[PDB]
mmCIF file with all atom_site columns, C-alpha atoms in Angstrom:
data_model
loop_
_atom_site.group_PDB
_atom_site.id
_atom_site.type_symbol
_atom_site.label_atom_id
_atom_site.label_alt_id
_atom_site.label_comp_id
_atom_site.label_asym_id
_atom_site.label_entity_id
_atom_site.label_seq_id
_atom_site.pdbx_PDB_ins_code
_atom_site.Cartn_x
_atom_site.Cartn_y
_atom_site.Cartn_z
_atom_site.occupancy
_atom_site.B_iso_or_equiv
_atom_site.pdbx_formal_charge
_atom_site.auth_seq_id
_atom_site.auth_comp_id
_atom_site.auth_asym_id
_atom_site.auth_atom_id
_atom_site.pdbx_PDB_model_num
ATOM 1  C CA . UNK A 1 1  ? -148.504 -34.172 266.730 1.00 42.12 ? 1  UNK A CA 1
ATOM 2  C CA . UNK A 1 2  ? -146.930 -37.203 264.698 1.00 42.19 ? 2  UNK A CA 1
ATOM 3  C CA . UNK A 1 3  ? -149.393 -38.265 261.912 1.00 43.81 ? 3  UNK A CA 1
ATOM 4  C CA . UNK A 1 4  ? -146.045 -39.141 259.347 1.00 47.61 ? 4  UNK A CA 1
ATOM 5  C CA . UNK A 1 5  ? -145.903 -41.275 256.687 1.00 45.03 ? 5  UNK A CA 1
ATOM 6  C CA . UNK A 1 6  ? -143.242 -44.846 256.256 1.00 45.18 ? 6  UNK A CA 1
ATOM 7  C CA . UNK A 1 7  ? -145.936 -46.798 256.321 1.00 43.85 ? 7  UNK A CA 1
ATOM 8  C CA . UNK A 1 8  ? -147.715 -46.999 252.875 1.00 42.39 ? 8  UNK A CA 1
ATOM 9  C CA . UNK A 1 9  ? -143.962 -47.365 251.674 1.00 42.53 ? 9  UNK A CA 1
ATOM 10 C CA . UNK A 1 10 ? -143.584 -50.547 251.803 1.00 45.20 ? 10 UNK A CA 1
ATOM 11 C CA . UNK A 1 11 ? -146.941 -51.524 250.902 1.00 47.29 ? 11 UNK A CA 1
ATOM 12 C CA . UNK A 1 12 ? -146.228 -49.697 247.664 1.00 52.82 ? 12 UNK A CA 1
ATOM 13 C CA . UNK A 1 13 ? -142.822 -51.314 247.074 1.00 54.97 ? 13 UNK A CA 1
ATOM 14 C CA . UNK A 1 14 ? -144.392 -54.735 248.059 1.00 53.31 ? 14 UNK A CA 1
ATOM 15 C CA . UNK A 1 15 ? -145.876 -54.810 244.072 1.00 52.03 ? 15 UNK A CA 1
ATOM 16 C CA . UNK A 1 16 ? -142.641 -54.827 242.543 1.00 49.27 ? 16 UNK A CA 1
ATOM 17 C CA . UNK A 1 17 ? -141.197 -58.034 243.827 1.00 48.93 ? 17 UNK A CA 1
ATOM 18 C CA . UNK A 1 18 ? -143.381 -60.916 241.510 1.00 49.90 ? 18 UNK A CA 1
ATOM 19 C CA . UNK A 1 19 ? -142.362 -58.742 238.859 1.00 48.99 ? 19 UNK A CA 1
ATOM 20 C CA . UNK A 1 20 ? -138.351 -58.433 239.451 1.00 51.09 ? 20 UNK A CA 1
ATOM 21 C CA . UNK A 1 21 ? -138.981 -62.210 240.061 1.00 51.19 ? 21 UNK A CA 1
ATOM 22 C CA . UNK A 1 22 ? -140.406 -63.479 236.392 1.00 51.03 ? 22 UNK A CA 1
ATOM 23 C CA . UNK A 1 23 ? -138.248 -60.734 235.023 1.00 48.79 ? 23 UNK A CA 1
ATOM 24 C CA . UNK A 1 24 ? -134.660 -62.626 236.366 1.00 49.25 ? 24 UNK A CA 1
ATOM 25 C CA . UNK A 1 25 ? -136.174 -66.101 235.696 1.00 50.10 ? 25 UNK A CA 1
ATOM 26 C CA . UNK A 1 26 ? -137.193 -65.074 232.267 1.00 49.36 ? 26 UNK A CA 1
ATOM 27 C CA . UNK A 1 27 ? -133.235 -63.782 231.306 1.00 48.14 ? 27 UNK A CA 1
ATOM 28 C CA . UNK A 1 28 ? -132.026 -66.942 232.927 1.00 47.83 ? 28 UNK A CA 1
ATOM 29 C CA . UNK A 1 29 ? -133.495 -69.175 230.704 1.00 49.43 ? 29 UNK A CA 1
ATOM 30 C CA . UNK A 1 30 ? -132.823 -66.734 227.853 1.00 48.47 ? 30 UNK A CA 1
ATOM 31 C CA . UNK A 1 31 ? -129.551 -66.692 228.785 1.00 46.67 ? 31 UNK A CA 1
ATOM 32 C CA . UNK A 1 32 ? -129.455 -70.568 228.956 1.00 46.61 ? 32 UNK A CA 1
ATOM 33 C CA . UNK A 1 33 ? -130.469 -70.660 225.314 1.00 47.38 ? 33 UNK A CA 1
ATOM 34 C CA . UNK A 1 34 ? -127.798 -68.970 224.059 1.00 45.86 ? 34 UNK A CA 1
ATOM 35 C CA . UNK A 1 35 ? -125.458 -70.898 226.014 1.00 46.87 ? 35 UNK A CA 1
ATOM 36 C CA . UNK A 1 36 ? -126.697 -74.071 224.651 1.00 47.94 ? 36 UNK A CA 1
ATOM 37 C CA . UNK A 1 37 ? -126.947 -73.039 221.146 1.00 48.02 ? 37 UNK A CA 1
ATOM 38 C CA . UNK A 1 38 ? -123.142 -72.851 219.697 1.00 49.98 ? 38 UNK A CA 1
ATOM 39 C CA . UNK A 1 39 ? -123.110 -76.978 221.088 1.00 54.38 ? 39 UNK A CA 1
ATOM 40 C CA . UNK A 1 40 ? -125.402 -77.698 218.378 1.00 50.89 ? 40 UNK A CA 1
ATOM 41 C CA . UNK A 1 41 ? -123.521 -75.563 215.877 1.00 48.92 ? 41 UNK A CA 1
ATOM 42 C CA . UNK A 1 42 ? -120.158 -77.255 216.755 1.00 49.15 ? 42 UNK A CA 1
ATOM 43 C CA . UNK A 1 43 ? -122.144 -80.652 216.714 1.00 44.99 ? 43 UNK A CA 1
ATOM 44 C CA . UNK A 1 44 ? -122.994 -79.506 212.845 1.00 44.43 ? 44 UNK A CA 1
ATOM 45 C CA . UNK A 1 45 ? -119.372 -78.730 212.039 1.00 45.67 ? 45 UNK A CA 1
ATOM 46 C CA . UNK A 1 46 ? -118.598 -82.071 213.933 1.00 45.79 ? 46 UNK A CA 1
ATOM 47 C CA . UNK A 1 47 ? -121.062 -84.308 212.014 1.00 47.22 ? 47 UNK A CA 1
ATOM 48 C CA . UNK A 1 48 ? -119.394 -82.915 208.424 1.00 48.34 ? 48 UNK A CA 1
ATOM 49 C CA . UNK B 2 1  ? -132.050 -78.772 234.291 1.00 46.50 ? 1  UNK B CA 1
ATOM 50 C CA . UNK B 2 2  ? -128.946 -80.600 231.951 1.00 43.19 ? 2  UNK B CA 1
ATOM 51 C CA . UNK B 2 3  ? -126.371 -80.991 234.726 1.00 43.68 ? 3  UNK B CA 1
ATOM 52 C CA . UNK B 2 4  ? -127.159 -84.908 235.421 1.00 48.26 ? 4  UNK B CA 1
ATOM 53 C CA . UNK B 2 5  ? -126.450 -85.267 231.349 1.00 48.37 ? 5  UNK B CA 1
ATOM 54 C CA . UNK B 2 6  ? -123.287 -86.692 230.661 1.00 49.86 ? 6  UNK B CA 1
ATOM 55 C CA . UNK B 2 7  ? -120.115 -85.473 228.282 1.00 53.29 ? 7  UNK B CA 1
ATOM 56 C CA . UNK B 2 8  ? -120.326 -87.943 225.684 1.00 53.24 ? 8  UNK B CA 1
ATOM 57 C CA . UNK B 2 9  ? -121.931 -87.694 221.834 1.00 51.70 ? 9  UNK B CA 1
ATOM 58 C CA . UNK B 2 10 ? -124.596 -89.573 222.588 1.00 53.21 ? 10 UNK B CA 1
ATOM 59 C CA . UNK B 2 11 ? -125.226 -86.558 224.958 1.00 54.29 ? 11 UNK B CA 1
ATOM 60 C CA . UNK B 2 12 ? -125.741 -84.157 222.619 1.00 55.05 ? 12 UNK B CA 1
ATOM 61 C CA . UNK B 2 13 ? -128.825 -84.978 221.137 1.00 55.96 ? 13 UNK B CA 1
ATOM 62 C CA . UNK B 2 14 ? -129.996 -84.360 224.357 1.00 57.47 ? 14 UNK B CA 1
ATOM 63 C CA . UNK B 2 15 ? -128.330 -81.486 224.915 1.00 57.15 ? 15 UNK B CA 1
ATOM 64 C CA . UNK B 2 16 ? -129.867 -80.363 221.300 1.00 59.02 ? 16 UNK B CA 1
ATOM 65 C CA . UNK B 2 17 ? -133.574 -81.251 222.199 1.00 58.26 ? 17 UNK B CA 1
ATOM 66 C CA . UNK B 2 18 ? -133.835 -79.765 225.533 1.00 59.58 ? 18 UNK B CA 1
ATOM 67 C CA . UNK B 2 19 ? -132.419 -76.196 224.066 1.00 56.20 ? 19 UNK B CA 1
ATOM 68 C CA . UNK B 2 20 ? -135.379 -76.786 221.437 1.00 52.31 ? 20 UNK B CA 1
ATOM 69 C CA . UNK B 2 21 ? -137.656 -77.288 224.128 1.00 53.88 ? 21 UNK B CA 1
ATOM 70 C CA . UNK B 2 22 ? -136.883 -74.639 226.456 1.00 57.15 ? 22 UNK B CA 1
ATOM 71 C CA . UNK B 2 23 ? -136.667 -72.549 223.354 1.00 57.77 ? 23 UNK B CA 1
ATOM 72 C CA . UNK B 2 24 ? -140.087 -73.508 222.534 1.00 57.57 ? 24 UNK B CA 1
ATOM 73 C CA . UNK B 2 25 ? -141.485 -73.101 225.943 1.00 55.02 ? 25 UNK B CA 1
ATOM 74 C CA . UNK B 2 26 ? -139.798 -69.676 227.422 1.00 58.73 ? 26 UNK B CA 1
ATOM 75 C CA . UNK B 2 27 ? -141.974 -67.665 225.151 1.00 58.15 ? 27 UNK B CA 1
ATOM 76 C CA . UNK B 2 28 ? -144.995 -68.587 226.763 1.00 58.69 ? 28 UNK B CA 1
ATOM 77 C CA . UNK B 2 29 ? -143.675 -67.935 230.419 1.00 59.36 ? 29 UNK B CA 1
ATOM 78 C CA . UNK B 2 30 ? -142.537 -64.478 228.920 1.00 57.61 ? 30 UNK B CA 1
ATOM 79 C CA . UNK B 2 31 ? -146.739 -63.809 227.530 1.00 59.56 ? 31 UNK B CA 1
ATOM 80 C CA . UNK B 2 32 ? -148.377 -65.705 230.671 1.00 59.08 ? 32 UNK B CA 1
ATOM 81 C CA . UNK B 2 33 ? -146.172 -63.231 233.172 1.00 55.67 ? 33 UNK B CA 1
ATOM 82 C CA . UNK B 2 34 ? -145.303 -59.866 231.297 1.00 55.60 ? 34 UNK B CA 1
ATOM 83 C CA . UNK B 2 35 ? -148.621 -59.318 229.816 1.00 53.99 ? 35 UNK B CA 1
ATOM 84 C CA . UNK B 2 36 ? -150.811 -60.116 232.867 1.00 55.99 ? 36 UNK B CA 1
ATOM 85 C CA . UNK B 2 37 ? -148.155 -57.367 234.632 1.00 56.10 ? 37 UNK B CA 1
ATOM 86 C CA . UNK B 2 38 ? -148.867 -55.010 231.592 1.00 56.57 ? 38 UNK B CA 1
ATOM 87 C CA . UNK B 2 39 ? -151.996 -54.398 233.973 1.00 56.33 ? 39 UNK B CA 1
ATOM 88 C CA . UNK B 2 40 ? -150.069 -53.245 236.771 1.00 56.00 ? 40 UNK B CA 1
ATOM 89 C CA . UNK B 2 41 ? -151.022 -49.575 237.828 1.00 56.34 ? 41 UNK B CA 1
ATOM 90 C CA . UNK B 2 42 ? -149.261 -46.865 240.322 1.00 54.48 ? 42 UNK B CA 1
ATOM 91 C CA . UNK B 2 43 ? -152.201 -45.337 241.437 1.00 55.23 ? 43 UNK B CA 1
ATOM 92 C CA . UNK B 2 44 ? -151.495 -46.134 245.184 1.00 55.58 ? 44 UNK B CA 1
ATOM 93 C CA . UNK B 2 45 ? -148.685 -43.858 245.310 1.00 51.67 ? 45 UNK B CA 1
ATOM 94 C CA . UNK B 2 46 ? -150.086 -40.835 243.444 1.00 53.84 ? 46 UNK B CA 1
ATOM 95 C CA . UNK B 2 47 ? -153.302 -40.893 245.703 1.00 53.85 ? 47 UNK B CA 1
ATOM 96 C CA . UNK B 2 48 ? -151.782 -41.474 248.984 1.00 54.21 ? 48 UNK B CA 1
#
């Protein structure tokens, strides 16, 4: 008979996703930070 | 989140306190998310 499996799969996989999510939201901000952080550095060097 | 901001000195300032504040506020995200998924288990796929 056919009692396979391809089923559970997914529901196993389906945890992963919230994760992955707050992960890449998390390193874009980061990411963000360090872009914004040499304008207030040059805005120092400006100021003097 | 800084894209309606202009490209003027007066700018920067904002510029300045919104890095602070996103600075300020990521780390929580990263505690609030990461170590509520610290609980995550993969028990699912060992049973089945």
């Amino acid at each position: 008979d056919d009692r396979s499996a391809f089923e559970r799969a997914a529901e196993v996989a389906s945890s992963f996703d919230d994760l992955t999510d707050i992960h890449r939201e998390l390193e874009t901000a980061r990411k963000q930070q360090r872009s914004l952080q040499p304008v207030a550095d040059g805005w120092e060097r400006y100021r003097a | 989140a800084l894209a309606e901001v202009g490209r003027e000195l007066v700018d920067v300032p904002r510029y300045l306190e919104r890095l602070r504040v996103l600075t300020e506020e990521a780390l929580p995200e990263k505690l609030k998310r990461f170590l509520e998924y610290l609980n995550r288990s993969s028990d699912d796929g060992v049973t089945q």
